């Protein structure tokens, strides 16, 4: 009624202490202020708005926020991007992200969807007004989404054009299956309670075959491309980890196994997710590098051939971090009431 959908310059707000030199906390010292000890969330009358998580501006604001952080904190000895290369230095730090709250300025208010099972698109009854986002960790992943929020009710599957195979699929789970990756040459590994992994994959298929008119859903390994979208990629406390899922996508097992062990590797030269380019980073020291994250949703891409056959094949996707921000920012929308 009185408000208008619009885009603005949202201001951040961590909790990071300046006593910690871990780059997150150091980056969070400026640009962003403290958290709300009593943040307000006012239930909007009893009307219902209509959101869209594929055309939000918070996503591109937060995409740029995190880009500065990475090229200000994790600076590559040499960063080569279309057009030119920039020679720098490579220090050794640690990476445990801080939950960040996003906050609209003077006049503007954040509209939020608390509708039980929402797919970030259209009708949204239970709407509300807040000044900040919520505790979201800015973790850069691929294939699986880690250290994030989980669905309250049923499992949510959601994209822009479900039917289109170019539109990336976001799988938001209802249970957080733990994972554990460690580096004890560079080769490291991971391990997953496959007993909960393939049992909570079962319901990811069942819900996925409710939008494809009870068809057949089969999972498969990535068709190919760049190593960061083939191999589940992330940054464990400083080094870039590429872990081969596969054994986690080889359809089947849904008494087969218990513990899964994806191999994995650590790369020092890698294609940037900031721009079309690549940059060499720094080796590590024997730190027994270990990340124990919460897998909480996956990035899948469908194949071309729906009507043809009685089945659909899905594969691990990603590459566009923007979708990584989209999975948590799916409920809020910027509004200007000035």
């Amino acid at each position: 009624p009185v408000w208008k959908d619009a885009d603005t310059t949202l201001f951040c707000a961590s909790d990071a202490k300046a006593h910690e030199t871990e780059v997150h906390n150091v980056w969070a010292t400026h640009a962003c202020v403290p958290t709300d000890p009593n943040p307000q969330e006012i239930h909007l009358e009893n009307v219902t708005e209509n959101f869209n998580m594929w055309k939000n501006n918070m996503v591109e604001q937060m995409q740029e926020d995190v880009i500065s952080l990475w090229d200000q904190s994790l600076q590559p000895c040499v960063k080569l991007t279309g057009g030119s290369v920039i020679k720098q230095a490579c220090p050794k730090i640690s990476f445990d992200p801080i939950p960040i709250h996003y906050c609209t300025p003077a006049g503007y208010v954040i509209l939020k969807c608390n509708d039980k099972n929402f797919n970030g698109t259209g009708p949204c009854k239970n709407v509300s007004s807040v000044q900040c986002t919520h505790g979201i960790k800015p973790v850069v992943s691929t294939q699986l989404l880690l250290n994030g929020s989980l669905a309250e009710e049923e499992i949510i599957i959601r994209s822009e054009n479900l039917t289109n195979n170019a539109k990336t699929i976001i799988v938001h789970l209802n249970k957080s299956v733990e994972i554990n990756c460690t580096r004890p040459i560079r080769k490291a590994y991971c391990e997953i309670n496959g007993t909960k992994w393939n049992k909570v994959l079962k319901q990811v298929t069942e819900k996925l075959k409710e939008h494809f008119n009870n068809k057949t859903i089969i999972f498969q390994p990535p068709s190919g491309g760049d190593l960061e979208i083939t191999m589940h990629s992330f940054n464990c406390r400083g080094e870039f980890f590429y872990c081969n899922t596969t054994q986690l996508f080889n359809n089947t097992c849904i008494g087969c196994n218990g513990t899964i062990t994806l191999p994995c590797k650590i790369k020092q030269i890698i294609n940037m997710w900031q721009g079309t380019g690549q940059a060499m980073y720094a080796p590590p020291i024997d730190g027994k590098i270990n990340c124990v994250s919460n897998i909480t949703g996956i990035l899948l891409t469908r194949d071309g051939g729906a009507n043809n056959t009685s089945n659909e094949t899905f594969r691990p996707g990603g590459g566009n971090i923007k979708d990584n921000w989209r999975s948590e920012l799916y409920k809020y929308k910027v509004v200007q009431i000035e």
Binding site: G82, N165, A166, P222, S223, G224, G225, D226, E228, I229, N271, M272, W273, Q274, G275, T276, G277, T301, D303, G304, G317, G318, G319, N320, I321
Partner: peptide
């Protein structure tokens, strides 16, 4: 993402090249 190139490569696997970000996928 360099896409004409991701397709150039993904060809050798008999696949279409498409940008996954700054990144090259094949379908």
């Amino acid at each position: 993402x360099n896409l004409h190139f991701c397709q150039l490569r993904c060809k050798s696997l008999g696949l279409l090249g498409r940008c996954a970000x700054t990144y090259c996928a094949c379908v």
